[PDB]
Structure 1
Amino acid sequence: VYNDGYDDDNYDYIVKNGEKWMDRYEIDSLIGKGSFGQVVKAYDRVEQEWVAIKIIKNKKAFLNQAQIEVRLLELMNKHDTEMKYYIVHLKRHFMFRNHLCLVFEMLSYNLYDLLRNTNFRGVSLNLTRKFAQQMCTALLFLATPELSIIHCDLKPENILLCNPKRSAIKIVDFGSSCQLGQRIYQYIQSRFYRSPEVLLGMPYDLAIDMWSLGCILVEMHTGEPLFSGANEVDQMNKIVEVLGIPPAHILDQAPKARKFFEKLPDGTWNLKKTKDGKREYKPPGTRKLHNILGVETGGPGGRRAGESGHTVADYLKFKDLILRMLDYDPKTRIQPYYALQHSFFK
């Protein structure tokens, strides 16, 4: 009925465990599914190693976006082995039965699965520091002028562990990514990790990934998302609870500024007033990250009192770096090279 019987009604390849492709790949199991298509675990019989295969939907719009993804991955390969790693390596791409397939190295589970393994108690600040250092190094690689790649969907699920017993991680899935001079989407990033400039409908650059990283790092240590908005208005309001009203010079140039805020006659911006006798959000900037992290009270849940790398000085350094990553202004938000110089690391 669809693609000579190889596709379902949603342009997806019907995965059958054990099938052999091109006398090379033995499909093992379904790993996951997304809007792009599916991801399967497979054994490369020629190279004798496990691989992950992204099976793109047999539909032109998804094929074309994956062709951009392949070009970006290949651009990173011309620099690869010669620059910051911490990025999932594209091993091969090919067409198979009207599906574009992307072969990657097979890694372990993602950082959200790690959080779930701890029952969302969070991981230590020492492990968070290691994750932060590797991700800042990976963002520095993307910031290479010839690359200038914006990932556009950084989240715990898109950061994979190399080995479930080690701290090595890699960024995965550049299916929504773009170069700085080639921006085509505006509804980008997962909502919890969406930058203010994207929420405000402003032009964005590579700084949006650094905003996502700040949200990710706090969640990794606390076990819970920092800004868990159910919609765009709720997301902006949860950001304002912690960070306050964005600067006026930003809101004055934001096309969607009045979707969340109001400009009083004095030129000062305020939040749009909620309705009737409904409970208000915390006043702007009163949900202090200082207390979300438990800087003076033994960390999240008080579980870190006396733990090495969890001194008050350590939490003050971590809080400072996060606030630099959560700068409202994308032109002054901390950049990957200078995040790596932060005293949180050395």
Structure 2
Amino acid sequence: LVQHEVLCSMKNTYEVLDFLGRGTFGQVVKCWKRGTNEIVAIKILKNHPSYARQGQIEVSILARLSTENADEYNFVRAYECFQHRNHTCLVFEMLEQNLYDFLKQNKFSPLPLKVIRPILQQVATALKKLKSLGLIHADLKPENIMLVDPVRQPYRVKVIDFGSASHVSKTVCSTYLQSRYYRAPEIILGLPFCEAIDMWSLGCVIAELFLGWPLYPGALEYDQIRYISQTQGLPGEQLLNVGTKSTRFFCKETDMSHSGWRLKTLEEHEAETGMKSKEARKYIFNSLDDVAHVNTVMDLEGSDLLAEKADRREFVSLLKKMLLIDADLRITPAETLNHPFVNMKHLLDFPHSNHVKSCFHIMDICKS
């Protein structure tokens, strides 16, 4: 389906104005709710039977989300639902700009920590509501986080993809289910995955926002887990033993000096798959603590700088806790909202610092 100007529904009717996206997910288009001054986004799903319950499940969760009022929990609001030419449509409120196109706007300049904080706090409260209902987003990525109104509401945001969401009843992963740069280790190796899958995605997102570039811009799933263990340490023996896909990226060295597992050398991969592995990280780290020493020229002197050095110490502290290789030990939405970095406890230790007075003024301004 596709058209340039026309549509209708049960109580409402919509005209299309411009295209907003088109791909495997279907087709999203921006429309005008005639009779009012609302512009809405409505997403059409393709009308093929093999994709039947893939659409039935997205509506089933959208309904379970309108009830329980996910709205005002920093989620996009789903207005109504209907059909048109046998296709199925979903009406959403219109948001302005997603974080990818926002980073691209500043030529991928790093965003300062003072701005990153309110965004995280909101995306955390949105995931917190998910866990309390038992849902997994599964596609949390920069493209799926948007500024309500980046000019009239400088920092409010909301989430906006559900084509990958599912209940926690699943305990098995058959194929890929995230955007690669943000796919959690559970998906890459093949283990029973939980809602932590998204908390990983949030790790690469806030990391991407601070560095200005993907933390792990792997070209293939191999490159991905290569960058990960190379930075954070090789995964744990118990994880790799029960992973289905772990034979594809790791080898079981039974050498005299073996803990049971070693990563496959590049040469072993290029000889196996035939694909030369190009380095893709704009940033290469030996440790995650190493992240605190990046983009270090600040134009701040005096107390302003010491506060910034303490803000970074607590940033890596949380990033490490969000990016635990293990799924269970990884920090949970409720616990991140309590971590000192979102809390800002460590900032109180700094009286009359004009950099700290401006950090608090960003959290308080988030409510308005």
Which residue does the alignment assign to 1:332?
Answer: 329
Which residue does the alignment assign to 2:15?
Answer: 26
Give the CA deviation at 1:301. Answer: 6.1
Mapped pair 1:162 → 2:114: no
Q: Which amino acid aligns with 1:88?
A: V
| CA distance in structure 2 between the partners assigned to 1:214 and 1:201 by the alignment | 20
SS across alignment from 2:267? coil
SS across alignment from 2:15? strand
| Aligned pairs for 1:84-163 within 5 A | 85-144=73-132, 147-163=133-149
| CA distance in structure 1 between the partners assigned to 2:305 and 2:66 by the alignment | 39
Q: Which moved more, 1:333-342 or 1:254-263?
A: 254-263
Which residue does the alignment assign to 1:64?
Answer: 53
Higher helix share: 2
SS across alignment from 1:214? helix
What's the % identity of the aligned pairs? 38
Q: 2:159 aligned to 139, 156, 171, which one?
A: 171
Superimposed CA distance per residue, residues 216-235 of structure 1 (whole angstroms, 9 cap, x where no aligned partner): 00101111000000001111
Mapped pair 1:226 → 2:215: yes
Which residue does the alignment assign to 2:240?
Answer: 251
Give the CA deviation at 1:36. Answer: 2.0
| CA distance in structure 2 between the partners assigned to 1:279 and 1:74 by the alignment | 44
Q: Which moved more, 1:153-162 or 1:54-63?
A: 54-63
| Aligned pairs for 1:76-87 within 5 A | 76-80=65-69, 85-87=73-75
| CA distance in structure 2 between the partners assigned to 1:74 and 1:89 by the alignment | 11
- CA contact under 8 A between 1:152 and 1:177: conserved in structure 2? yes
| CA distance in structure 2 between the partners assigned to 1:115 and 1:24 by the alignment | 35
Return 5+ residue gaps in structure 1 as ranges: 1-12
Return 5+ residue gaps in structure 2 as ranges: 271-275, 344-368
Which residue does the alignment assign to 1:191?
Answer: 180
Superimposed CA distance per residue, residues 15-43 of structure 1 (whole angstroms, 9 cap, x where no aligned partner): 21x32435721211111112121111111
Q: Which moved more, 1:29-38 or 1:266-275?
A: 266-275
| CA distance in structure 2 between the partners assigned to 1:26 and 1:78 by the alignment | 27
| CA distance in structure 1 between the partners assigned to 2:61 and 2:259 by the alignment | 43
Identify if the C-alpha distance between structure 1 residues 185 and 69 changes in structure 2 by more than 3 Å, giving closer, same or farther. farther
Runs of 4+ residues over 6 Å off in structure 1: 276-281, 307-310
Which residue does the alignment assign to 1:315?
Answer: 312
Alignment root-mean-square deviation, CA: 2.5
Give the CA deviation at 1:185. Answer: 5.0
Mapped pair 1:275 → 2:267: yes
| CA distance in structure 2 between the partners assigned to 1:245 and 1:181 by the alignment | 29
Which residue does the alignment assign to 1:289?
Answer: 288
Number of positions where the alignment pairs a residue of Structure 1 with one of Structure 2? 324
Give the CA deviation at 1:289. Answer: 2.7
Mapped pair 1:264 → 2:253: yes
Superimposed CA distance per residue, residues 112-150 of structure 1 (whole angstroms, 9 cap, x where no aligned partner): 011001100122111111111111111101001xx2111
- CA contact under 8 A between 2:7 and 2:84: conserved in structure 1? no
Q: Which amino acid aligns with 2:288?
A: L
Which residue does the alignment assign to 1:9?
Answer: none
Identify if the C-alpha distance between structure 1 residues 92 and 64 changes in structure 2 by more than 3 Å, giving closer, same or farther. same
SS across alignment from 2:21? strand
| CA distance in structure 2 between the partners assigned to 1:156 and 1:162 by the alignment | 14
Which residue does the alignment assign to 2:338?
Answer: 341
Identify if the C-alpha distance between structure 1 residues 106 and 286 changes in structure 2 by more than 3 Å, giving closer, same or farther. closer
TM-score (norm. length: structure 1): 0.87
SS across alignment from 2:340? coil
| CA distance in structure 1 between the partners assigned to 2:236 and 2:214 by the alignment | 24
- CA contact under 8 A between 1:109 and 1:164: conserved in structure 2? yes
- CA contact under 8 A between 1:84 and 1:140: conserved in structure 2? no
Superimposed CA distance per residue, residues 137-170 of structure 1 (whole angstroms, 9 cap, x where no aligned partner): 11101001xx211111110001111012221111
Q: Which amino acid aligns with 2:198?
A: D
- CA contact under 8 A between 1:63 and 1:100: conserved in structure 2? no
Mapped pair 1:181 → 2:173: no
SS across alignment from 1:28? strand
- CA contact under 8 A between 2:14 and 2:33: conserved in structure 1? yes
Give the CA deviation at 1:262. Answer: 2.0
Which residue does the alignment assign to 1:300?
Answer: 295
Identify if the C-alpha distance between structure 1 residues 196 and 261 changes in structure 2 by more than 3 Å, giving closer, same or farther. same
| CA distance in structure 2 between the partners assigned to 1:248 and 1:286 by the alignment | 23
| CA distance in structure 1 between the partners assigned to 2:37 and 2:227 by the alignment | 48
Which residue does the alignment assign to 1:4?
Answer: none
